[PDB]
Amino acid sequence: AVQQNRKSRSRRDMRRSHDALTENALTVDQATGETHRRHHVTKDGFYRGRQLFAK
Amino acid sequence: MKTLSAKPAEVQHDWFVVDATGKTLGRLATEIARRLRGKHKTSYTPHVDTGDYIIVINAEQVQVTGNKALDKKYYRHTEFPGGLKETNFEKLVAHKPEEIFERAVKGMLPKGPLGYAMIKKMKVYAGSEHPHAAQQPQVLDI
Amino acid sequence: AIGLVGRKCGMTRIFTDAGVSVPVTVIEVDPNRITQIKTLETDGYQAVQVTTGERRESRVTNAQKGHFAKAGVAAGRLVKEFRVTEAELEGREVGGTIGVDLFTVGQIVDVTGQSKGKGFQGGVKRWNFRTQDATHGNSVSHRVLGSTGQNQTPGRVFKGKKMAGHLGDERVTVQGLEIVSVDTERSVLVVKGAIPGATGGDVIVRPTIKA
RNA sequence: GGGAAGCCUACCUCAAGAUAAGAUUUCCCUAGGACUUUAUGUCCUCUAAAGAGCCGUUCGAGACUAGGACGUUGAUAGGUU
RNA sequence: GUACUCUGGGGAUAACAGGCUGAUACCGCCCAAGAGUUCAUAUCGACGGCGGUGUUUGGCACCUCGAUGUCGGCUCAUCUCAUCCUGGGGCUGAAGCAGGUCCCAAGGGUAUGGCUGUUCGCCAUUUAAAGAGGUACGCGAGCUGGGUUUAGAACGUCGUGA
RNA sequence: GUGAGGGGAGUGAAAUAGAUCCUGAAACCGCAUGCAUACAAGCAGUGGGAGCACCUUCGUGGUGUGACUGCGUACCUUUUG
Numbered sequence: 033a034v035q036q037n038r039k040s041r042s043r044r045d046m047r048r049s050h051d052a053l054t055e056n057a058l059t060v061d062q063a064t065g066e067t068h069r070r071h072h073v074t075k076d077g078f079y080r081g082r083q084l085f086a087k
Numbered sequence: 088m089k090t091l092s093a094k095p096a097e098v099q100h101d102w103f104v105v106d107a108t109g110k111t112l113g114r115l116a117t118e119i120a121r122r123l124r125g126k127h128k129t130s131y132t133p134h135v136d137t138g139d140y141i142i143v144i145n146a147e148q149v150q151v152t153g154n155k156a157l158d159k160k161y162y163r164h165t166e167f168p169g170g171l172k173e174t175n176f177e178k179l180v181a182h183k184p185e186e187i188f189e190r191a192v193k194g195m196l197p198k199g200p201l202g203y204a205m206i207k208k209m210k211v212y213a214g215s216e217h218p219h220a221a222q223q224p225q226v227l228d229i
Numbered sequence: 230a231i232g233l234v235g236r237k238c239g240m241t242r243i244f245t246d247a248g249v250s251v252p253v254t255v256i257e258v259d260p261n262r263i264t265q266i267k268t269l270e271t272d273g274y275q276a277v278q279v280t281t282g283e284r285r286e287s288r289v290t291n292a293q294k295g296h297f298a299k300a301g302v303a304a305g306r307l308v309k310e311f312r313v314t315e316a317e318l319e320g321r322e323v324g325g326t327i328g329v330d331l332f333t334v335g336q337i338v339d340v341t342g343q344s345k346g347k348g349f350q351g352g353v354k355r356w357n358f359r360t361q362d363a364t365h366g367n368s369v370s371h372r373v374l375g376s377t378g379q380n381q382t383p384g385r386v387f388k389g390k391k392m393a394g395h396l397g398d399e400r401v402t403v404q405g406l407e408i409v410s411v412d413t414e415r416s417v418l419v420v421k422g423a424i425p426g427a428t429g430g431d432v433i434v435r436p437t438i439k440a
Numbered sequence: 441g442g443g444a445a446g447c448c449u450a451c452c453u454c455a456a457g458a459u460a461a462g463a464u465u466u467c468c469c470u471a472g473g474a475c476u477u478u479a480u481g482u483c484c485u486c487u488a489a490a491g492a493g494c495c496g497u498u499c500g501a502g503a504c505u506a507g508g509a510c511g512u513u514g515a516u517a518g519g520u521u
Numbered sequence: 522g523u524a525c526u527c528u529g530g531g532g533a534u535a536a537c538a539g540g541c542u543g544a545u546a547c548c549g550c551c552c553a554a555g556a557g558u559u560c561a562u563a564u565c566g567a568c569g570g571c572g573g574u575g576u577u578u579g580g581c582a583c584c585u586c587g588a589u590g591u592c593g594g595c596u597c598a599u600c601u602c603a604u605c606c607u608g609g610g611g612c613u614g615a616a617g618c619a620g621g622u623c624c625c626a627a628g629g630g631u632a633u634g635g636c637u638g639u640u641c642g643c644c645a646u647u648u649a650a651a652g653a654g655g656u657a658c659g660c661g662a663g664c665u666g667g668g669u670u671u672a673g674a675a676c677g678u679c680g681u682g683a
Numbered sequence: 684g685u686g687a688g689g690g691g692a693g694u695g696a697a698a699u700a701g702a703u704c705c706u707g708a709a710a711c712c713g714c715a716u717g718c719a720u721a722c723a724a725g726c727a728g729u730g731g732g733a734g735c736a737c738c739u740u741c742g743u744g745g746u747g748u749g750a751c752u753g754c755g756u757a758c759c760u761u762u763u764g
């Protein structure tokens with residue numbers, strides 16, 4: 033099956049009106065003072081007062 | 088250019104009360120629709136609503152002539168395959184006179200947004216008393 | 230009709246003196262606490278609103294806290310109403326308790342609950358359709374719906390056509406169940422038959438309406 | 441007046457987007473300026489209430505959604521007994 | 522001669538379906554000799570006449586040949602009453618149990634197999650019953666391809682031959 | 684990223700003449716401003732028409748949008764149509 037007429041740009045945009053993105057949950061860490069994803073380990077290896085990959 | 092139209096902001100609507108006991112449905116409905124659309128005012132315009140508010144009292148006391156008390160049938164249809172409901176005038180005016188008057192007046196009014204706005208200016212009550220006492224309505228003959 | 234709000238605990242059997250095994254269902258009932266009484270002059274109808282369960286203070290909002298404090302009862306896990314008459318309203322004041330002693334052994338009742346959800350289901354399981362042949366050159370169409378209607382008259386699909394969709398998870402009332410017995414020290418009602426819902430769901434038991 | 445598996449109620453479910461948008465109980469928000477076009481007027485300063493959402497552990501809920509319970513004042517999930 | 526076929530064109534012109542018409546078919550009504558029996562307009566009813574719907578066979582060529590692509594079977598349904606059962610009545614050669622005719626009533630229900638591609642029809646055994654029809658003679662961008670109507674081969678008939 | 688690409692400086696009469704290099708249109712695709720739009724049915728226009736927003740040779744004026752309303756079933760071929 034295929035369309036019988038063109039779809040105007042208005043209907044196309046009305047259909048695309050549900051394609052908006054959303055932001056993530058970012059919080060400031062209490063220990064390192066850096067922005068990080070909530071409930072996630074910081075990129076340096078720190079999470080909840082603990083430090084992985086001791087250097 | 089000299090022919091002017093009514094400004095919708097400058098139109099004023101006044102309240103009236105009509106008693107519907109022992110009156111024929113058709114003539115009363117025509118008069119109500121005429122006074123509701125605004126044909127009685129000299130500033131009448133077809134695209135502006137200049138009517139008045141009409142309150143009907145004693146809605147169940149309306150009467151019809153001949154044998155239309157049992158032969159007048161009202162039909163409605165739900166788009167289901169077998170949903171054709173049919174009712175009589177007697178039972179309908181017994182338990183819902185407002186539907187009777189609303190049908191009678193909507194049948195004689197234009198079909199569109201202006202008609203939908205005009206039909207809201209009519210109030211129908213079965214009892215002999217109406218809550219719109221603050222607007223100070225004036226009694227109308229018929 | 231004054232009823233009770235209980236929780237389904239599971240199914241069991243009970244052997245009589247003659248040896249007949251009766252399949253029963255257990256409903257545990259915490260003593261309901263009357264929260265509000267609705268009369269005709271203020272609301273237009275007469276009813277009794279009760280609550281049951283237990284909820285922590287962190288999950289109860291300020292509005293519900295004020296409502297329960299006005300009622301003078303502890304906060305429950307749910308609240309339900311019962312449409313009653315003035316004859317059944319004798320000795321029913323706010324803050325009271327509707328115990329399990331409302332029913333008697335041998336009474337016919339109705340049980341209302343929430344059925345289990347099966348998810349998006351097809352026609353065969355939902356409307357008891359018939360499956361086509363699996364052999365004799367049959368194509369990919371095995372459990373399909375089949376035809377839908379006529380071609381040009383009316384030329385559309387009628388409203389109410391049976392098709393695939395969500396199944397279950399809906400309010401269901403089963404009438405005609407006999408309370409096989411009631412135990413007040415454990416506050417339970419064992420009733421003959423099966424009731425809708427899974428274990429741990431809320432059910433409503435009311436007196437029968439057909440008698 | 442009597443009068444049928446016929447109609448309206450009666451039984452079960454849905455239902456106020458019924459734009460005619462209904463009702464009940466409870467809860468929350470009571471500061472200091474400037475200017476103009478003196479108006480539920482526009483810019484500043486000071487607080488963000490009751491609640492909802494984001495996130496996480498999850499389900500007898502579930503295509504994605506939505507819905508139910510819980511988040512150290514904890515038995516929501518895993519482990520152990 | 523082409524069923525091995527091909528090109529340019531047509532609904533100007535056929536086969537299927539729709540439309541107009543209702544000769545034909547179905548149903549109803551009027552008069553009525555006669556008949557079962559010696560009589561009951563209880564029940565049929567000759568010779569004649571008047572209408573209704575559009576379910577059969579037909580007539581006409583208005584749409585479609587720069588395509589409306591199907592005989593039957595399967596799954597899935599919806600509507601009409603000219604009612605098969607269940608429901609309510611009048612009359613009767615209605616003693617009762619039963620039967621026959623007519624009126625009202627569409628809520629629900631309204632078989633399995635053998636033989637054939639079968640629709641249909643015949644047969645065996647059940648049920649309260651196994652109703653008549655419309656919907657592109659419902660439904661093939663939902664399934665099947667057994668029949669018809671491509672290309673191979675043979676028999677019977679016709680042709681000197683294709 | 685010792686990449687592509689871009690912003691400065693500089694050359695040039697001219698750099699939206701920068702090597703995808705004279706001028707550089709339409710279909711098509713973004714951003715900003717102004718008005719309208721989430722209870723009302725169809726060739727999307729036309730004749731009226733209130734309001735709103737910027738202009739002023741401050742008007743029985745201009746530029747945009749335009750709720751509400753009467754009427755209104757595209758173009759070409761071939762045909763009795």
Ligand SMILES: [Mg+2]
Binds near residue numbers: 359360361
């Ligand atoms: Mg089968």
Ligand SMILES: [Mg+2]
């Ligand atoms: Mg149509």
Ligand SMILES: [Mg+2]
């Ligand atoms: Mg001709």
Ligand SMILES: [Mg+2]
């Ligand atoms: Mg009949």
Ligand SMILES: [Mg+2]
């Ligand atoms: Mg019968």
Ligand SMILES: [Mg+2]
């Ligand atoms: Mg098709």
Ligand SMILES: [Mg+2]
Binds near residue numbers: 722
């Ligand atoms: Mg409306």
Ligand SMILES: [Mg+2]
């Ligand atoms: Mg609006």
Ligand SMILES: [Mg+2]
């Ligand atoms: Mg115009």
